[PDB]
Design an enzyme around this catalytic site. Structure first.
Site, PDB file in Angstrom:
ATOM      1  N   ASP A  35      39.724  41.029  25.775  1.00  0.00           N
ATOM      2  CA  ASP A  35      40.213  41.243  27.138  1.00  0.00           C
ATOM      3  C   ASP A  35      39.099  40.932  28.134  1.00  0.00           C
ATOM      4  O   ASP A  35      38.230  41.774  28.389  1.00  0.00           O
ATOM      5  CB  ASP A  35      40.669  42.681  27.294  1.00  0.00           C
ATOM      6  CG  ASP A  35      41.199  42.979  28.674  1.00  0.00           C
ATOM      7  OD1 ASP A  35      41.423  42.027  29.443  1.00  0.00           O
ATOM      8  OD2 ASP A  35      41.389  44.176  28.980  1.00  0.00           O
ATOM      9  N   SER A 199      40.595  29.237  42.686  1.00  0.00           N
ATOM     10  CA  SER A 199      41.311  27.997  42.442  1.00  0.00           C
ATOM     11  C   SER A 199      41.487  27.228  43.744  1.00  0.00           C
ATOM     12  O   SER A 199      41.620  27.809  44.824  1.00  0.00           O
ATOM     13  CB  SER A 199      42.679  28.310  41.833  1.00  0.00           C
ATOM     14  OG  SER A 199      43.485  27.153  41.699  1.00  0.00           O
TER      15      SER A 199
END
Length: 330
Positions: A35, A199
């Site tokens: 994770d 992004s």
């Protein structure tokens, strides 16, 4: 040193991925959910409330000759999905794919929430976010990667998750045969303890690329791709019959639909998520309404590049003094 371990989807939908981890002496192998959005290595154990164990493999520290109770240490964690767990702490030897850390904090669960009990395939979590998020008290503990970093050939790990298939976590090296083209690296902020990056935009199907900054986290422990409501609405508008369902808890779509791809930007590079990666199947057994793999982050507070996005790429978690993330197509 290096390590390399295969990671395997827990079910036919890729709801999560499990990776075998050796703990203790002799080794006890548990299948952990790696994770990158959390920083605790915790396991089902011989100390877990018996009624809260339902098929998981447990760590028994009394059977490990290298286990040592970390005196006074406790832990307690709550995840973004409402699940939780807590317990006490041992140090022990932990190996992943041939890479061994001695003195790793292994957080033994005394209590787990029902969602963990009900998932017999996940024996615990191995956190790979920054150690500033580790919950051990009163002395915070380091992640497996943080403990291994100085010994690794290069201070990196990579995630290569498969679509409906096994994939690989590598530590200490970049397998140049595992991706196509080049790896594009992008800046990371560690201020919230995550692999947080920006992004450069997105496209839906064959549509034009929209240049827009989308700050979010690379999170292998989250199944879906959670993005701003504007982006998600633009995606699902291209699927006839798709709608946001308040009762189901997100966008659903007719199971007969063909889903468009979704592209996200990494600098000037582009990662294409095929449409079928966005299909999470019937909302309930036998239903013709299917659950979408791209959902709004509006109720979260952060955008999350979870497995739906990450499995379309070869992803480098570069833990150099100034961390960065790398993405390649594959």
């Amino acid at each position: 040193s290096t390590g390399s371990a295969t990671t395997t989807p827990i079910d036919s939908l890729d709801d999560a991925y499990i990776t075998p981890v050796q703990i203790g002496t002799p080794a006890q192998t548990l299948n952990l959910d790696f994770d990158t959005g959390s920083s605790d290595l915790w396991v089902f154990s011989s100390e877990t409330t018996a009624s809260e164990v339902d098929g998981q493999t447990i760590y028994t520290p009394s059977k490990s000759t290298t286990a040592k109770l970390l005196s006074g240490a406790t832990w307690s964690i709550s995840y973004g999905d409402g699940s939780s767990s807590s317990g006490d702490v041992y140090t022990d030897t932990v190996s992943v794919g041939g890479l061994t850390v001695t003195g790793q904090a292994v957080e033994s669960a005394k209590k787990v929430s029902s969602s963990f009990t009900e998932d017999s395939t996940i024996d615990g979590l191995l956190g790979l976010a920054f150690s500033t998020l580790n919950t051990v008290s009163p002395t915070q503990q380091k992640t497996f990667f943080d403990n291994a970093k100085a010994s690794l050939d290069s201070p990196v790990f990579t995630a290569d998750l498969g679509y409906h298939a096994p994939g690989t976590y590598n530590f200490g090296f970049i397998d140049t045969t595992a991706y196509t083209g080049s790896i594009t690296y992008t800046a990371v902020s560690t201020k919230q303890g995550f692999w947080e990056w920006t992004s450069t935009g997105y496209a839906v199907g064959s549509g034009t690329f929209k240049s827009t900054s989308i700050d979010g986290i690379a999170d292998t422990g989250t199944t879906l791709l959670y993005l701003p409501a504007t982006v998600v609405s633009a995606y699902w508008a291209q699927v006839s019959g798709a709608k946001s369902s308040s009762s189901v808890g997100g966008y659903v779509f007719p199971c007969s639909a063909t889903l468009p791809s979704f592209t996200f930007g990494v600098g000037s590079a582009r990662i294409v998520i095929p449409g079928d990666y966005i299909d999470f199947g019937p909302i309930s057994t036998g239903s013709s309404s299917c659950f979408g793999g791209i959902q709004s982050s509006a109720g979260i507070g952060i955008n999350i590049f979870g497995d739906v996005a990450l499995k379309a790429a070869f992803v480098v978690f570069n833990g150099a003094t100034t961390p960065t993330l790398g993405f390649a197509s594959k």
